[PDB]
From Swiss-Prot, chain A:
Changing Y40A: Increases affinity for histone H4 that has been dimethylated at 'Lys-20'. No effect on recruitment to double strand breaks. This is TP53-binding protein 1. Residues 12-40 are annotated as: Interaction with dimethylated histone H4. There is a cross-link at K80 (Glycyl lysine isopeptide (Lys-Gly) (interchain with G-Cter in SUMO2)). Changing Y19 to L/Q: Abolishes recruitment to double strand breaks.
Length: 120, 10
């Protein structure tokens, strides 16, 4: 039905990476107001919004560490606990659980998902 | 009065 309230992964224009958030308002003209999980609110073009919740198994993604580093990996698991989503990310034969908002997509990684999940 | 840090890039 409506996109308002749905979780998405959407491009932050300042670095071109896609981050977890929610659509909070239809602002017309192919644009949506997003509330990112980190609290930032701004308008984003539909073409830069991916309607996936969760990011699907086997997707190539980027994971942010608690100490400001990023690395590429592949989604191999999901788990819900206390109303919060966690991703199992595989890198070089090993895995690590990350909170939802620490899993992001580079421009190339988000581009792969646009045809199937993009809103523009 | 606090603002989101992502506003620092605008």
């Amino acid at each position: 039905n409506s996109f308002v309230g749905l979780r998405v992964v959407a491009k932050w224009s300042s670095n071109g990476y896609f981050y977890s958030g929610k659509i909070t308002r239809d602002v017309g003209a192919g644009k949506y107001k997003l509330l990112f999980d980190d609290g930032y609110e701004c308008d984003v073009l539909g073409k830069d919004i991916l309607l996936c919740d969760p990011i699907p198994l086997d997707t190539e993604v980027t994971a942010l560490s608690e100490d400001e580093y990023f690395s590429a990996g592949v989604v191999k698991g999901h788990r819900k606990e206390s109303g919060e989503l966690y991703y199992s990310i595989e890198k070089e034969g090993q895995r690590k659980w990350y909170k939802r908002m620490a899993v992001i997509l580079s421009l190339e990684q988000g581009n792969r998902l646009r045809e199937q999940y993009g809103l523009g | 009065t606090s603002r989101h840090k992502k506003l620092m890039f605008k």
